[PDB]
Subunit: 445 residues, 4 copies
C-alpha cells in the first residue's frame, strides 16, 4: 500500500528464505525456473550470501562447483542438476560428456567458462569464519587444504590457456563467458559470426520470461548456438579453438576481475601458509592482467576497451565494462580521476533520469541503450555489489558506501530480480534470483 518496501530485518529474512528455497541439497539454482541449475559466478555470489548463515553450507557450494572442474582446470559456467529440465541449451546440446576429453566424471557441465569471482567468495567465507570461533575456522581452513590446488589450477588455466600470448588479457570464445550475454560490447564481433547448417532447436528461456523486450532475440540465439557447433566440432580442444572459432575477443572486464582475484588469492595463500611458488605466480598474474587492462584504456578518459582478436581492432562501446580499471587499479592518477568522473557524471550514475544512483549496464545516452533489454541498459545488483566491494578495497570507502546504500534501496521491494529498469525501478527478468539475495545478505551484514 503506502510503502511496499521491507525493513532491513524483513529483507534479510526474505533473502535468506529465498536462498534456502533455491537449495537443491549441494547446489543452489541460480533462479527457480529460468536458471534451474548451478551457474559458476552465481555460485560464488551464492557462497558469499550463505557465509553469514552457514559457513559449512557456503563451503559446500564451492566444493560442488569445484567437483565439476575440468581436467585442465577450467571451471565450466553451468553444472547441470541431475534429472532437471527446462533450460536450453541443456546437457544433450552441449555434448561435453561424450565429446570433451577434459570434462569431469559424474557431473554434467557446459563447455565454456565464466568470470573468476571465486577467490572473492573464498575471502568472504574466511572473514565470516574468523568471527565465529574455532570449529567454524576449522571448516573454512579444511576447505582451503582440500581446494587450494583446484583454485590454483583454475587460475593457471586462465593465465596459460586463455592468455596464450601473455598479453595480460583473457580471450573469450563465446559472449556467454563474459557473463554479459547481449551486451553491446559484443555486437560487432557477433556480426561476423555466420551460422552454417544449425541443428533445429526451441528456446526455453522466453517460455519463462515471455516479455520479448527483456531477453535476447532469436537472431542472437542463432549465433550463440552456432558457436557451440564450432566448439563441438573440435571436441572442445583448447589447442584448436583459435583456429576454428568465429568469435574471439579479449574481455577487459573479465581480465580486471581476474587481476583482483589473483591478488586476493595470493593474500589468502600467504595468510594460510600455502606454497610460496603458488603465491608468487598469483602476484605475477595479478600484475600482468593489471597491466593488460591499463594498456587498453582511452588516453583521455581512462575508459577500458575490449579487443576483437579476429578483426584485430579495439571495441569502443559505452557500457559498465569500460570501468574495469577501477576494479584492479593501475591507471596513472590523472586518468583514474577522469574515469571516476565518467562513472559519476551524467553518462552513467549521475544521469538525471535514473531512479537510483547505480551503474546502468549500458549508458542511457548511448544509441545502444535499451531500458529493458537485459545487458543493454538495465541496472544489475550483481554489478553494484562487485563495484562496491572492489571500491572499498581500493580504499574508496564513501564511494563503496554510496553504491551499497542505493543497492539496498533498490532491493527493498523484495523481488530479488536480476536486473531493474533504470528509470522506473521496475524489476525485470526472473524474480527470485539467488545472487541478488546474496548481495543483499552481504550488504546488510
Amino acid at each position: 500500500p503506502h510503502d511496499p518496501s521491507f525493513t532491513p530485518t524483513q529483507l534479510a529474512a526474505r533473502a535468506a528464505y529465498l536462498l534456502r528455497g533455491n537449495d537443491l541439497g549441494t547446489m543452489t539454482t541460480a533462479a527457480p525456473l529460468l536458471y534451474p541449475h548451478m551457474w559458476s559466478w552465481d555460485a560464488a555470489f551464492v557462497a558469499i550470501g550463505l557465509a553469514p548463515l552457514s559457513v559449512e553450507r557456503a563451503v559446500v557450494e564451492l566444493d560442488t562447483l569445484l567437483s565439476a572442474q575440468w581436467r585442465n582446470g577450467m571451471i565450466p559456467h553451468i553444472v547441470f542438476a541431475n534429472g532437471v529440465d527446462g533450460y536450453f541449451p541443456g546437457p544433450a546440446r552441449w555434448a561435453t560428456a561424450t565429446l570433451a576429453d577434459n570434462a569431469p566424471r559424474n557431473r554434467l557441465t557446459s563447455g565454456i567458462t565464466q568470470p573468476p569471482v571465486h577467490a572473492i567468495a573464498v575471502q568472504r567465507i574466511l572473514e565470516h569464519a574468523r568471527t565465529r570461533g574455532r570449529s567454524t575456522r576449522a571448516v573454512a581452513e579444511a576447505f582451503l587444504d582440500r581446494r587450494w590446488g583446484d583454485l590454483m589450477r583454475w587460475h593457471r588455466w586462465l593465465a596459460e590457456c586463455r592468455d596464450r600470448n601473455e598479453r595480460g588479457r583473457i580471450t573469450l570464445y563465446h559472449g556467454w563467458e563474459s557473463g554479459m550475454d547481449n551486451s553491446p560490447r559484443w555486437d560487432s564481433a557477433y556480426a561476423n559470426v555466420v551460422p552454417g547448417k544449425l541443428p533445429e532447436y526451441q528456446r526455453a528461456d522466453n517460455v519463462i520470461i515471455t516479455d520479448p523486450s527483456q531477453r535476447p532475440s532469436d537472431g542472437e540465439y542463432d549465433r550463440y548456438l552456432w558457436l557451440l557447433e564450432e566448439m563441438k566440432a573440435v571436441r572442445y580442444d583448447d589447442e584448436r579453438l583459435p583456429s576454428v572459432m568465429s568469435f574471439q575477443v579479449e574481455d577487459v572486464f573479465f581480465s580486471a576481475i581476474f587481476s583482483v582475484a589473483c591478488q586476493v588469492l595470493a593474500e589468502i595463500g600467504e595468510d594460510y601458509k600455502r606454497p610460496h611458488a603458488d603465491v608468487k605466480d598469483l602476484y605475477l598474474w595479478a600484475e600482468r592482467f593489471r597491466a593488460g587492462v591499463v594498456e587498453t584504456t582511452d588516453q583521455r578518459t581512462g575508459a577500458a576497451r575490449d579487443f576483437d582478436v579476429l578483426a584485430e581492432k579495439w571495441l569502443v562501446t559505452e557500457t559498465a565494462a569500460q570501468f574495469a580499471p577501477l576494479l584492479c587499479g593501475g591507471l596513472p592518477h590523472d586518468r583514474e580521476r577522469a574515469l571516476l568522473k565518467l562513472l559519476e557524471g551524467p553518462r552513467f550514475c549521475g544521469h538525471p533520469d535514473l531512479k537510483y544512483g547505480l551503474i546502468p549496464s549500458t549508458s542511457p545516452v548511448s544509441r545502444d541503450f535499451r531500458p529493458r533489454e537485459y545487458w543493454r541498459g538495465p541496472v544489475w545488483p550483481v554489478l553494484t555489489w562487485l563495484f562496491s566491494w572492489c571500491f572499498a578495497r581500493r580504499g574508496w570507502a564513501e564511494r563503496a558506501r554510496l553504491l551499497r546504500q542505493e543497492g539496498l534501496r533498490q532491493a527493498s521491494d523484495g523481488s530479488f530480480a536480476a536486473y531493474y529498469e533504470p528509470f522506473t525501478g521496475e524489476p525485470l527478468g526472473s524474480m527470485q534470483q539467488s545472487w541478488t539475495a546474496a548481495a543483499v545478505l552481504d550488504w546488510l551484514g
Copy 2:
C-alpha cells in the same frame, strides 16, 4: 570470540534460513531430528514466523494442519510426516488410523490435542496480509473462506467435549496436551497413574538429546505411554474417556489461551463478515473460559490453580501457568496487581540470579525447580512470545516491550533452542527449534 552474538539482520536471516530448512514441502518439522513431524501448537507459531516471509506458505502450514483435523473437530497434537521415523511414540504406537472412528483419512496423527493458539496465528497472518496489497489479501481471505468452518469446529469441540459440565475450563487426559510434558503442575496427578502390563518400547528422544538432565525420566515415560493404552482400549471414544482415564485434569493455562483465542477469532469473524451465530458463540466461550480461569485463582495473589478432576482437588504449584489470568483478563483490579507483582518479583522475572528478565517455567525458589529439566525451570522463548503478545493486547505496552527485548537478547546467540538454562543462558534441548525461529522473526519485524 569477543561477542558470539548476531546483529538483528543476521539473526532474522538465520531464523528464516532455519524455517525454510525445516520445511518438508507442506509442513515444517518442529525440530530437525528430535521432533521430525508437524506439532500442533508449533505449527501455529511456525505460521506466525512465515507470515512476514510468505503469506501463501503461512496459509499452507495451517491448511496442512487443518486437513488432519478429526471428524469431531479435534486438532491432534502430531501430524506425522509420511515415511519419517526417529520419533517415539510413532503412528504404530498410537494406532489411531485403525482404532479411532474420528481419525482423518490420508493423514497419520496422534490421538490427543494441544493448546488452541491457532486463532492467534490467523490474526498475525491477516495483519501481515493487509500490509502487502490486494493479491496477498486475497490469499489470506480465501484461507478464511475455506477454513472458517474448520476453526469453528475446533473451538466447538473444545467447548463441548472437553468442558462437558460448562465449567469454563478445559479437561486434559494427558500431560502432553498441556504442552508442558513434565511440568510440576502434573506430578500429583501422575502419581495416581499406575501402568498395568505396558507393552515394551524404547525411547527415541534421549537417543537425540542424551543429557539425562534435560529430558523426562523413564518412570515418567512409562506413565505417558500407559495413558495411550487406556485411550486405545476405548478406541479414543470421547464419551468413554471420563470413565477409563487415570489422568483427568483441568488445565487453567490451556483454558486462558482458549479464552483469548475465542475472543480473537470472534473479532476476525466480525471483520470478515462470518456468520453471526458463530461470532456470538465465540464471544460466549471467551467469557465462559475467562470466568472459569478467574474462579481458580488464589484470593490473595491472584495465582491460577489447575484442578485434579479425579481427586477433586486444587493443584497448587509455582510454575509460569499460574499467570494464566494475565493472558485472558477477568481478575478484579486489586488481585491483578498482586499477580503482576508476583510475576515481576523475586519468585519469577525479578529473581536475582537470572541471566535475562524472562519467565522461568518453574519458580527458581520452588522445591520443584530444576535448572535444566525441560519444563521444571528453564526459560522457554515460546512462553516469552505468548506472554508478550497477550500483554500488548491487554494494553501493557511497556511490559510487552520488556519481554520482547529480553527474548531477543537471549536468542541473539542464534542457537534457536527451545529452552535455556535460566542462570547461565546455556541453550538446552534441541537446537534449531522452529517455533523459536518463528518468535524471533515475529519480534524483529
Copy 3:
C-alpha cells in the same frame, strides 16, 4: 540527492540535537522563532522526548512548568521566557501578573489553560527511569514526592472549575485552550463572538510564518484577542467567567485526554503508594469524563461531538476530535467498531490521495478542509503520537504500530515540522518544532 531522508540513527541524533538547541536552561521553547517560550502541552511532549536522554532534565522541564502553576491549580498554557520578545500576545497583553489574584509569583504566564497530557509524560519518565537503575529511579521518585500534590491540584481544578455541573466534559473559554486554534470545530462558536472596541495590535506570528495559507486570518485573531479583553475585565476570576465569556464550549477531545490522564495518574498513584483518597478521586474523574465523552457520540458512527454551551447545541464537524472516544474507551462494542471504520476509511486515514496513512486534522472530504491551513486539514505528528500511544494502551498493538511507522516515515526528512501537507507531505508552519522531535525520539526508542 536521490534520497533526502535520514537513517533512524541520523534522525534520532538530529532530534536530540534540536531539543538541546531549543533548551534555554530550565525550559525548552516550543519552536525557535515562532514560539520562543514554554507552552504547556508542548512541554509535556518535550519531557517525553527528553526522558531517553536525561531523566533529570526531563523532570526539570515538568518542574519548571509546575512552578508556574496558578494558586487555584490551573496550569497556564504559556510560561514566558524572561526577556524574550517576538511573540504576540505577550505578557503585557495578558496582564495576568497585574489582574489575576491566582497568578504565580516570579513567573509570567498566560491566563488560559491547555490539555492535560502531563500525567502521560510522567508515566514515560517513570518507565524510562525504571530501566536505568537505582539513582535514576531516585530522581523520578523524588519528583513524584515533590509534585504529586501539584498534579492532583491540576486535575482537581479541571474537574471542579471547568466541569461545574458534573457533566464529565471540560468547558473552554478560548479556542486556544483546545490546542487546535483554528479548527472547524469552533467556527460556529466563534461566529457569535462580536468584539467591541479592541485595543490595537500587530500580529507577530505571520511575520515569521509569512505564507498566509498556513496561519489563521486577521478576523480570526481579532476574535482571539477580544476574548482576552473579556477575561481581563473580570480579572480572570473563575466564578465570574461564565457570566461574561462570549465563547463557552465543551471540548470532547480535551475531555477524553483528561479521562486518560486521570486513569494514568491513578495507576501511578497506586504503584507509588500515594494517598488512597487521591487515587479514588482520580478513578472517579476518569470514569465521569469517559461517560461524558460517550454521551456526545453519534449513535450510528460513534463520532464524538463538541457542545456550544451558550448556543446550547451540539457542534457537528468532521475533524480528528471526533475520535475522542477511541482514546479513553467506554463506547458500546458495536459503536466503537463503527468509529474505527470511520477512522480507517476514505474520510480519514483511508483517503486515496493521502501520502501517508495518518490522521489529518480535518477530513479531506469535509467542505471545511483546507490542505495548508493549520488545523483545517494538515497532518500533525503530535496527534499521530497521541493516538498511537493511546491505541497501544487500548491493546490495539498493530494499529498503534502502523501509525508509528507512517509517522517515522513522514518525519524522516528531518524538518521536524509541526504539521504537513496531507497530499504532498510538504512540511508547513515552523520547522524545528520541539514536540515533533520529541515524538520521533519516543517512537525510535
Copy 4:
C-alpha cells in the same frame, strides 16, 4: 537492570545531545569540567561528529579554530574560552598574548601545537555535504574558499618549521604536542628534563579527576610546566627553540598523521580546483613524511620508533604509536604483514584478557603497562576511530569494520569516556568527552 547498554538510536541521540550540550556558541568544549576550552585535535573530531547534524555548525567549529591560527601558520593546541577558569595551565601561565609576536589578536591560545587531523575533518564535512544537496554544498564550498589558504599555511608551517632538516618527521618540543601526554614513548626524553626554579602552581586537572591512578604524577607535571618556562624565555620564537628546549623529539605518529592529512588535502585540492602549486607541495609533503615514517621502522617487525633529537637515539617503546606506518602506507609488503601480525597478536588486540578487540595505548605485556593510567595502557575510542578510518582508506575494509564494531560495543554504555580500562571496560577519566561522542556519531551513521 539486566542490560545497561543503549540501542543504536538511543546512543546516537545521547551523543548528539552531549555535543550540543558542550557547545559554548562558536566552540565546543573538549569536556565539561576537566577540559572546558577548545582543544585542537578534539575540535577536528567534534567537527566530524557535527557534520551529520549540521554542516553549517561543523564548519563554524573549524572556522573558530582557524581564527586562532598563529601568524606563522601554527594551530595552537588550546583556544581558551573567554571568561572560563578551572583549567591549568591557563592563559596567564602561557603568557602567549604578551610574549609571542605570532600569537593571534582577540584570541587567547596556548603556545604549542597538536596533530594535524583537521584535513580529515574537512573530508568528512565535504562527504556529508555532497549527500545533502545544493545549499549545504555551497556552505562547505564557501568554507573551502575561505580557509584553503589557512589550511595550506598550517601544513606549510609543520613541513618547514618542525622539519627543518627535511627528514620527513615532525619535531615536538613538548609531550603535550603528541596528544599522548604521559605516554611511555616520552619517558626517557622527560628523564633528561631538569627544572630550575619553577614558579609555584596548583594543578586543577586532579581536583576534577581525583583518582590518582588516572592522571599523570606531580613530578610529571613539574616537567611539563618547566618546558613552558623554557619556551617563554625565548618568547616562543621558532628559530630560537632548538637552542633552548630540553625536550626535542621526532614524533613518528604525528608524522604519519601529517602524511595522511597532506594526501587528503591534496585530493580535496584537486576535486575543488585549488592552485596547482599547492596540490603539488601537498603531495610532496605526503611522500616525504611517508618516507620519514618508514625510515624509523624495525626491519623485522615494521614497528615505528620515535627519535630523541637531543640524545640522538631511537626511542623503542611498546605503544600504539608503533603502528604509525599502517596509517600512511609505504612499508615493504613483507614488513607491513609483520606489523599487522604484531597489531593483531597477543601483544595488542589479540591479548586474551582484553574485554574488547581494540588497540590499547600501551601493550599489556610491556613493563610500562598501567591499566588505569591515561596513555600508559587504556583503550581510547579516538585511536579506535582514527585507526579504523585510516584502515578503510588503505582498503582494509574488514579490519576497519571490526574496530568500528568493537568501538560501538565499548561505547554503548553511554558514558562517552575518553579512555577505558582494557580488561574490565570501566570508563576512566572524564565522562562526557566530546570527541568520543563524535566518534560514535560518525560510526553509527
